[model samples]
Target: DKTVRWCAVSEHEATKCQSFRDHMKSVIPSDGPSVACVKKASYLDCIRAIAANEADAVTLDAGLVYDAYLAPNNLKPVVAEFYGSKEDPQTFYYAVAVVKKDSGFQMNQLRGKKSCHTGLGRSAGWNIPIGLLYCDLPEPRKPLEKAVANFFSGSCAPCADGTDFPQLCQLCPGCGCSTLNQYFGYSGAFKCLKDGAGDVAFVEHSTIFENLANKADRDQYELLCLDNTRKPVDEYKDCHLAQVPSHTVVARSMGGKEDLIWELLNQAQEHFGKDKSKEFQLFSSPHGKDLLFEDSAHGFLKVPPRMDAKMYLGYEYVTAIRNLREGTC
Candidate 1:
């Protein structure tokens, strides 16, 4: 029986993730064989480990989940995060574009502008936004790197290959990579916009609320709404681009201990969820930081017992993801 493994993307994340692993030992019920776990150094490491059967599971971005679905291990989402309106609570969030309040840039004017993205192939930053631009490009089908580089004068797509398209990753501050650049993740992309490094930032809805953290500062920024209309960040669900599936807890479709992983998470959330108000916080940080999940997420919704990654990610979203993949990557 393989033990469950929780992978943390960075050292800061690993510290808390390991703590959660230890905390799980106390509450997951000792009577039966449930979750057993350890923290890996990075997300890529965790993915590799899962593929080789060295480890069992970890939560991953939907973009990463798409990568996981392809190749060696053929992983599937065992659990997915849920969000949206109360009446129809769904497992997704909107991918929106942002700009300074007075930028005066129009929807059709996005080309030739500088841009910031969370990372390459990320749902909001790369896949959804650039994929939307695909319809506007002369060729509906082609290398995204060329179109984006031509469209945006410069950008900060963290995982983009410099040899393939140097300009796409040029303006990004620092070492031009994940964890190295303050312009790499959602908050960092917004920071790139705030710092005037780029004219537009493609990020998720919660990014503004998290980075701004106050109305006065937030007032300086505005969401670059689709349909050529702009709106306050609060109106994103109504005025945003695509509603993407939330991150997921992935495991191999076969030969992995799925039950143990689920029960372990169910118990962890019950104990650490912000809604539950446990001593150990899961989603939010007590010391002015973030970990494992987005600080804005109050809780996680369980994916149905039988759901696989494809079913959980939904058909249309998956189709969009498939549409943007490049041979150059």
Candidate 2:
């Protein structure tokens, strides 16, 4: 008999995985095996678990999949994406930019303005926004060369002494990433802004709106409309924004029960549908359907076919660390 193990983000997502597991248990060969599921804190952690052989499969964001593959960790993505929103046949990822509503500075006014960011290493929290900021910069100010240089130097710096360096610590820094005094983690970022740590903070759209909207002074904070280039913030009111992808399921390079894993995922999808009851909506639907998958100046592309953690580190790791060190926040 064979058993399938799976992981997913959030209890809501795990409910879907469990449904898939139940369906597989009913349909797969009785002697084949059983299905198992677990909830991971973040997509990055899930990939690490797969590489470490702690799990057999995981559902994660497609963007994270690219980062995981670039990291060259022991993981492989087996299935095409499954769209959860009826608003569009394609997949979309959503994030938010939080700013003080009273701040006279507009979104495009970010230059030299303090911006709070989660760790640059995070795909949604850091990478997506960083990519957008890069597109916002003038051609000469583009940091690609600097980013590349930082990546290599950071990765090799600790190793010059012969110590085993952890890849996570070394990486290229993206715009808004280096300034940590202003940046805050997802949970702490909003409060940090209110405390004058930064003029604006990057956060998941839903989370930010929910938090501020619930506050007595919700009107004090404004949700700046960031454009494709993340510039001319005013123009964004009429412009469609880029959509980030949700995480996907991945496995260690060692391979496992691929067929069983797929079966469970499908079941999870159905379960999610039922649980959401008709209220289930695509993450990007509120922004407008035309904006779905529309390319933004930020250079966000569809999730690549494959990703390696090591490869990504080769590209951006060093700069990220440097940005962390040089920038006050």
Candidate 3:
């Protein structure tokens, strides 16, 4: 019996997966693998389930993709969500450090400054920025978060709630890790800087443009480059903390049923992609946000056969993530 089992992280996601399976009945070819939905408590649980063969696949962000590829669970990315347009199909975005044009501090001079972040543990907002800026402590005196707590005067990295580093939430209004925090996400992080609560905001390159529609407004902010120089917001590709790959559907490294997975996604998108079908939307769910895949994605692209999770996440980005886990010193 050919089947592609999907792992869902929440009850809402499981419901969506079941709906997808029911919807597939109308269009899936008779010879194609059938769909099965499996619910897990969290992404980590889903990853374990897929590795144990209790489930076949689940989508993951680049950060988790790194962990998924490590030893015991050698999951590989089989499909990547694409944004922008069908003609361009962008699968990556720049993680950038944004500062007011007149902030006058270079990347090298960020110590003792106030900072804003999307959230604790988020890719562009936390992982990439902290991963890149973290300094090697003389000794293992504290956790990386503690080291970071002393690195900056204060910060608004939401989701850092309950963390030992209370200073990380000092600049925040609600001071919690959830949506209740005013400085909790990309836009909120930007707002932290715009509202004079922080010196810099760590977010995806597009965040500035997305929040500030006016060219003049956007030009008031600049990107901090690794070379200690600042560049216009539009120059993010050349001056970014890291290039984060898009979220991807991962399967086991061996017998992952990649071909079947791709076929199912390809056909599903054909019928349910965007506004293609009013009855069902493959990339979205009204019941919840990011249930199975990102709602903002335009379509899915096949991962190159030669690309595994490590290769897909890239050597540099992987090193950064590793640095976060194991301090350089």
TM-score of each: 0.87, 0.52, 0.74
Per-residue alpha-carbon lDDT of candidate 2 for residues 1-329, written as tens digits (9 for 90 to 100): 36666655445445555654665566555665577776775456667777777777754434445555655585656543534334444344455666665557655555555544444444445555555555444444323333422322231111011122222133212222111222224433555566665565665544454334455576566566654233322232332223454444566656656666555444434433323323322122232211111111111112243444333223454344334324333
Local error of candidate 2 at 144, Å? Answer: 10
Kindly list the per-residue Cα lDDT of model 3 for residues 1-329, writing each as its tens digit: 67899998767778889999988877777887578999876667788899899999888767777778887988898899887777789998788999987767998787889999876666788788776666632235357777787888988877564446789888984455333455766767888999989999998787787677799788789999999999999988899987788889999988788998988888888888988889988766776545687665789999998698778888877777777867554
Q: Which stretches of candidate 2 lie above 4 Å from their native place?
A: 7-33, 37-45, 79-84, 87-90, 111-119, 132-198, 209-220, 226-241, 272-329
Candidate 1 residue-wise lDDT, 168-216, digit = tens: 7777643254344678778878888999989989998988988887888
- Per-residue lDDT for 113 in model 2? 55
* Clash numbers, per candidate: 1, 46, 1
Evaluated at residue 53, the lDDT of candidate 3 is: 90
- Candidate achieving the largest lDDT: 3
Let me know the TM-score candidate 1 reaches against the reference structure: 0.87
Candidate 2 lDDT for residue 219: 50
Backbone clash tally for model 2?
A: 46
C-alpha lDDT score of every prediction, in listed order? 0.73, 0.45, 0.80
Best by TM-score: 1
